Amino acid sequence: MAEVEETLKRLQSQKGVQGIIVVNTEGIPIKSTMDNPTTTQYASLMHSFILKARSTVRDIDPQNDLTFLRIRSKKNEIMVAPDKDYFLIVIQNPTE
Amino acid sequence: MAEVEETLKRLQSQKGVQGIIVVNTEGIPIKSTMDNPTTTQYASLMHSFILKARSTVRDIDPQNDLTFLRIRSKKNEIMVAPDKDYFLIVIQNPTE
């Protein structure tokens, strides 16, 4: 549990940092490196989308499940790994 | 256009083949290596989901867009690249 939170900080990567938002089972981000308005505009928008994967994923068969996800984007990389009782959107990049 | 269709065949990869489904702007798969019932059960289910990315993606800002996507799954890899007037779900795997 505590080690898992430490992993989130490792998501900082190095500097690409497009914005980091940690969200719990509540939907509301328990933490974020964003100013504030970006945090909810993305958190609320991404939160709804992330549940679609687990929902859509389970709809076909319980045999499989969502272990990780990453949407490509011209402006930045989109990736949100849903863990145990917490999940987060990691907006960052390789300065590419 | 014709070269793009040839690329789809290259998606065969080597043998992982979990199922390959080509879908056009119609929603209905213009082609597939699946028996038949799997093709529509996944195509119709995946079709709705794929549009959510472009929809969700554009909802935040037109500056970015979905160039490619890949959902992780315990049973197989999920990936569907939406191209110009056609897009397809490539279900395959590295026999891992």
From Swiss-Prot, chains A, B:
Cysteine pairings via disulfide bonds: none
List of residues that carry N-acetylalanine: 2
Cellular component terms per the entry's GO annotation: centrosome; ciliary tip; cilium; cytoplasm; cytoplasmic dynein complex; dynein complex; membrane; microtubule
Entry-linked Pfam families: Robl_LC7
Record GO terms (molecular function): dynein intermediate chain binding; identical protein binding; microtubule motor activity
Tissue expression profile of the protein: High expression in heart, liver, brain and pancreas; moderate in placenta, skeletal muscle and kidney; low in lung, prostate, testis, small intestine and colon. Isoform 1 expression is up-regulated in 64% hepatocellular carcinoma (HCC) patients.
Keywords: Acetylation, Cytoplasm, Cytoskeleton, Dynein, Microtubule, Motor protein, Transport
Localization of this protein: Cytoplasm, Cytoskeleton
Any GO BP: visual behavior
Family classification: Belongs to the GAMAD family.
Role played: Acts as one of several non-catalytic accessory components of the cytoplasmic dynein 1 complex that are thought to be involved in linking dynein to cargos and to adapter proteins that regulate dynein function. Cytoplasmic dynein 1 acts as a motor for the intracellular retrograde motility of vesicles and organelles along microtubules.
Subunit structure and binding partners: Homodimer. The cytoplasmic dynein 1 complex consists of two catalytic heavy chains (HCs) and a number of non-catalytic subunits presented by intermediate chains (ICs), light intermediate chains (LICs) and light chains (LCs); the composition seems to vary in respect to the IC, LIC and LC composition. The heavy chain homodimer serves as a scaffold for the probable homodimeric assembly of the respective non-catalytic subunits. The ICs and LICs bind directly to the HC dimer and the LCs assemble on the IC dimer. Interacts with DYNLRB2. Interacts with DYNC1I1 and DYNC1I2.
Name listed for the protein in its UniProt record: Dynein light chain roadblock-type 1
